[model samples]
Target: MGMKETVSNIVTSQAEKGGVKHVYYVACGGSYAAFYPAKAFLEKEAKALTVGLYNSGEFINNPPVALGENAVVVVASHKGNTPETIKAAEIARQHGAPVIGLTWIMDSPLVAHCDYVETYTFGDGKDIAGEKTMKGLLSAVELLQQTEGYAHYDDFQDGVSKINRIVWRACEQVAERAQAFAQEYKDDKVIYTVASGAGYGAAYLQSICIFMEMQWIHSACIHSGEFFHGPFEITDANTPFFFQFSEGNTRAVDERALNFLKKYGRRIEVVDAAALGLSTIKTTVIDYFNHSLFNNVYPVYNRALAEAR
Candidate 1:
């Protein structure tokens, strides 16, 4: 089978086994972006058993959590060949945690080490980061939905299909917005990315990685509603911000936008998966799910805009 098939099958098998007590998502920088989407999906369907962790050199420094025998550990890497991830996997192995690994290469160290492995066939694909992250979202959502028990939607695949389309489309749509966005900040020295609730992951990867890396602009990805505490004072007209406003508590929305406009940076834009009509997707699963439209369209948008530039 292909990468998608391999991942789907492993996730389905795990979901059938069920009984996950705690799930630790491990990855480095790029994988960290995928981790948020993974956590959001698992939390929505699993029996309150989702946790997020960065796979870094410091992972060995932190104390292990109190996990029962039913713990599941999910790890991701583009090549599944990161040394830190391998070391972290070794640590989890000592605890007897069931490991699920996602990666691009078939014979990578991750594929050999993981108890459950999903091999993405695009091992040498140019846009490996975006593609692998998309697969991560798909696998994580499928596993949680399969094991939802009572939380499963009546039409689970419908939700998946809808999200897939939405995310791909949203990415395409946002690329235009992001491109226009890049033009605005060409003069500005700093750009900040912020989102709360499930929307935080997009800020991390989309804003930080793809935008900052490709555009060579200074950027920071922060959690939504966090600006009011102290960051609110740092803003002026020269600073630009990209705020991810997804559906959530009214208080958070009101306060974040209000403070951002009033105190921090009014030079702002809202790129919402919901406002783009992706809200029809069951947000209960994952934030990255909103990018169903992105995988197909955003990359195209990115390419088109780059050519225009």
Candidate 2:
């Protein structure tokens, strides 16, 4: 069986057995970001299904109370050898939950303990790595929906079919703006990223992996809803800010901050996935998966930052 068939069969068989209660998507860093869309999908589409997402380290340190024989755990790692993730797989297996690992290498440590492995080779870049992992994750979600008797499975697939083209268009839309964004914030000591709903994962990933870890800049990822309570105090005319405005339930949360940021912050960049021409998608539930659009376009900024350095 192909990867899709294998993963779908697992979900199908588990569903038939009738004890499974929760599905856990576990990973760290970029890999964790890749899991967010599916986590969002299962939450929105599968009414009876419970989903959990965790950083691999946090998962291992304090496994979820509901993780057990009735659980399914999915782990992804580009290197396939993140020590904490390896331990997470082991823990999931020990708890009798089937473990699925997404990795690039067939022989890597992450695949060693996995009940099944989804492996692939792809272009080398953080954004590319993230998109590839998301493809695998969404495929698994498509299958799970089929098994769960969801009627919108085809609608979801149709929406996904247009993603590559839509993302390409978004790249063109953001290209010149990204260069200006990079030039404006390239020397800033700290950057703040605010987002909510489906785009939260992208905001969190870019702030931590791209800005802080890779570029050695100080950054924070704040949820738009939480910003007003405390993080808003950090806003100033000189602060660098990036806001991801998603189209779904959390759109207002982001707009609330965008209003304040535009008024006070001189350096601000907003990536509104709703404005990216994805309006053709019939299902709003899948909007959370639209993080791929942001991932496709924001690399322009990364490239500009590299050139500036």
Candidate 3:
């Protein structure tokens, strides 16, 4: 059986037994960010399934009460040696919850603790691992939904095929702009990134991984809904802001921030799905998945930074 079929069978069998109450996607850093799209999808589409995401350290330290025999924890660490992640797998197993581990190596500490393991090597490179990891998680959710009586698994798969095509194309289309955007902001000492709904995780990843860790730029990622409550005060003509706007329900939250920034902030870069040709997605039900296709585009800006430095 294929990976999705295998995973779906496990989930289905668990459901038929005492019932599967929740599925937790536990990881840290990039792995945690990779599962965000699946977590968001389950939150919106799967009425029968409950989803949770937690950092591996937190999962090991104070695991959720719901993470017992009735739960399944899905975790991924590219190297399969993340200490906290391995511990999380062990803890989940101890509670009688089956653990699914995604890693690049099969014979590693993470696999030792997992009941099931999926090994993925970025045949392309690690640069696109985040995109591929998102695909992997989404596939599991797609099968889960199908097993639970959703007939739209084919629709989801079709959307994923299109996503694979458009991700690189979108990056190409935005290449020049990304270079210019990066150069324009290269000297800035601080940046604030904002997003809402499904796009927020990508925004957070970009803020921490690209800006702070890679470029040594000070940055903070804020949800659009929380912009007005506290982060808005720092926005002025001199402040730099990056906003990721999606077609999902929380678009208005981002729109509110964009409108305010357009009027007051002199340095702003808006990453909008509509601008990236994501409107080609016809399935309104799965339109939010388009945000996953946008994650790869940010690497263009990072490339620009590398060239300038």
What's the lDDT for all of these models? 0.58, 0.74, 0.74
In model 1, what is the error at residue 145, expressed in angstroms? 5.4
**Best prediction by TM-score:** 3
Q: After superposing candidate 3 on the true structure, give the runs of residues whose Cα lies further than 4 Å from its correct spot.
A: 121-132, 227-232, 283-291
lDDT of 1 by residue, 275-307 (tens): 666667554443445433332333543354344
Q: Which ten residues in a row have the lowest lDDT in candidate 3?
A: 123-132
Off by over 4 Å in 1: 1-19, 42-50, 63-68, 120-150, 171-179, 227-232, 247-265, 283-288, 291-309
**Tens-digit lDDT track for model 2 on 230-252?**
35465555777777878766677
TM-scores for every candidate against the unseen true structure: 0.74, 0.87, 0.89
Pairs that collide in candidate 3 are: none
Quote the positional error of residue 137 for candidate 1 in Å.
4.7
Predicted structure 3: lDDT: 0.74
Candidate 2: which stretches are off by over 4 Å? Answer: 1-4, 124-130, 143-147, 227-232
Candidates' RMSD to native: 5.0, 3.0, 2.8
Sorted on lDDT, best first, the list reads 2, 3, 1
